[PDB]
């Protein structure tokens, strides 16, 4: 199985620490007694391949050899030192949290929160598009990809127009992080690298704007954001895979 590597000064303290971790549901891959050496750090490095999070050492009341510490530093293996057990636990939990956040940041572009915008006014047509809108459903967040869905009458074929991402939100000049549904109208700034759609040409003020969800976006949302996402937001998402023709 997979798990962290622990080390204690004595056998008894080791047993106690292991019992503690048992109650904490923290899995242990291997153990050791006495000073930490390069070999033990390597033994954690074995765990590095299977689980990056679990390639860490919980060391209780134990000297760490400079060689071992240096190898750990060279190969990204965390070594945790503590005089008391609970401190070690705390350090580990914080570590796992940090790992979670770092995993979020790579999927930051991917995670998109569902929202439907009805344009109230237009301040800048393009480069960058700025639009006074009110969130009629869902929740508008920063860095949210926006798209307008519309079918040309002659073609009768659905067109998806990606406007770009939201870089700023402001209401009465006051900067906002997000805008919930039903909230009073706000002005949002959407911009993208390269050529960008233009109001009064590609799209009109009447056209309703939707968050640009993608199968990948869904997958990311259900991978890291399950706790956060409202039921209504899931509902909206399922409504949105239809308009975006998602599998
Ligand atoms: Cl996309």
The beta-strand segments (E) located in 173-232 are 174-175, 178-180, 186-191, 209-211
Tokens 């070594």: give the residue: 79
Distance 53 CA to ligand 1 centre (A): 29
Instruction: Report how far residue 151's alpha carbon sits from residue 174's, in angstroms, rounded to the nearest whole number.
Output: 36
Do 139 and 115 touch, CB atoms closer than 8 A?
yes
* Cβ proximity of 169 and 176 under 8 Å: yes
Structure tokens at 81: 């030192």
Nearest partner of 38 among 11, 72, 12, judged by Cα: 72
CA–centroid distance, residue 212 to ligand 1 (Å) = 6
Q: Is the CATH number 3.40.50.10050 carried by domain 1-108?
A: yes
Q: Taking each helix axis from N to C terminus, what angle separates 11-23 and 85-106, rounded to the nearest 10 degrees?
A: 50
Taken in order 34, 59, 11, 38, the sign of the CA dihedral is negative
User: What Å distances lie between residue 108 and 100, 105, 213, CA to CA?
Assistant: 12, 5, 13
Residue with structure tokens 């240096």? Answer: 70
Cα(57) to centroid(ligand 1), Å: 40
CA of 146 to the centre of ligand 1 (A): 9
State both tokens at 174.
């006051």
Cα 115 to ligand 1 centre (Å): 15
**Cross-strand partners of 165:** 145, 191
d(CA 147, CA 139): 15
CB-based contacts of 128, cutoff 8 Å, min separation 6: 164, 167, 189, 190, 191, 196
Q: Sketch the domain layout of the chain as residue ranges.
A: 1-108, 114-214
Under CATH, domain 114-214 is a member of which superfamily?
Answer: Translation factors (2.40.30.10)
Centroid of ligand 1 to alpha carbon of 96 (angstroms)? 29
Experimental method: X-ray
216 C-alpha to ligand 1 centroid (Å): 9
CA gap 91, 179 in Å, rounded: 35
If 0-12 CB within 10 Å is exposed, 13-18 middle and 19+ buried, where does residue 17 land?
A: buried
| Peptide bond between residue 128 and the one before it cis (omega within 30 degrees of 0) | yes
Q: How far is the CA of 164 from the centre of ligand 1 (A)?
A: 9
Distance of alpha carbon 167 from alpha carbon 224, whole angstroms: 23
Which H or E run contains 161? strand 158-171
Grouping H, G, I as helix, E, B as strand and the rest as coil, residue 47 is helix
Bridge partners (DSSP) of residue 166 are 190
Query: 211 C-alpha vs ligand 1 centroid, how far in Å?
Result: 9
Half-sphere exposure for 155 (CA within 13 Å, toward CB): 6
Alpha carbon of 193 to ligand 1 centroid (Å): 14
17/92 Cα distance (integer angstroms): 13
Secondary structure percentages of the chain, helix, strand, coil, to 5: 30, 35, 35
Q: Give the burial string for 47-83 (b: 16+ CB within 10 Å, else e).
A: bbeeeebbbbbbbbbbebeeebbebbeeeebbbbbbe
What's the gap between Cα 136 and its chain centre?
25
Angle value at C-alpha 143, between 138 and 149, nearest 5 degrees = 60
Q: In this structure, what token pair is assigned to residue 175?
A: 């900067």
Nearest to 146, CA basis, from 167, 175, 121: 167
Residue 232 Cα to ligand 1 middle (Å): 22
């Amino acid at each position: 199985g997979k798990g962290v590597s622990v080390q204690a000064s004595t056998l008894g303290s080791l047993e106690a620490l292991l019992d503690f971790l048992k109650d904490c549901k923290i899995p242990v891959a291997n153990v050791g007694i006495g000073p930490v050496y390069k070999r033990d750090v390597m033994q954690c490095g074995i765990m590095l391949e299977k689980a990056p999070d679990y390639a860490v050492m919980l060391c209780f009341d134990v000297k760490v050899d400079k060689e071992a510490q240096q190898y750990a530093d060279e190969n990204g293996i965390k070594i945790f030192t503590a005089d008391i057990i609970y401190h070690l636990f705390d350090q580990f939990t914080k570590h796992m949290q940090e790992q979670l956040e770092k995993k979020k940041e790579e999927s930051k572009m991917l995670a998109v929160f569902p929202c439907v915008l009805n344009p109230v006014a237009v301040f800048n047509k393009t480069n960058p598009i700025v639009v006074g809108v009110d969130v009629v459903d869902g929740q508008l967040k920063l860095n949210t990809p926006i798209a307008a869905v519309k079918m040309n009458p002659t073609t009768g074929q659905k067109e998806i127009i990606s406007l770009g991402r939201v870089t700023g939100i402001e209401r009465d000049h006051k900067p906002l992080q997000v805008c919930k549904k039903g909230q009073p109208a706000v002005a949002i700034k959407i911009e993208m690298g390269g050529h960008q759609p233009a109001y009064g040409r590609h799209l009109d003020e009447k056209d309703v704007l939707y968050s640009h969800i993608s199968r990948a976006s869904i997958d990311v949302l259900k991978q890291f954001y399950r706790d956060v996402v409202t039921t209504d937001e899931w509902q909206l998402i399922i409504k949105l895979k239809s308009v975006f023709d998602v599998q």
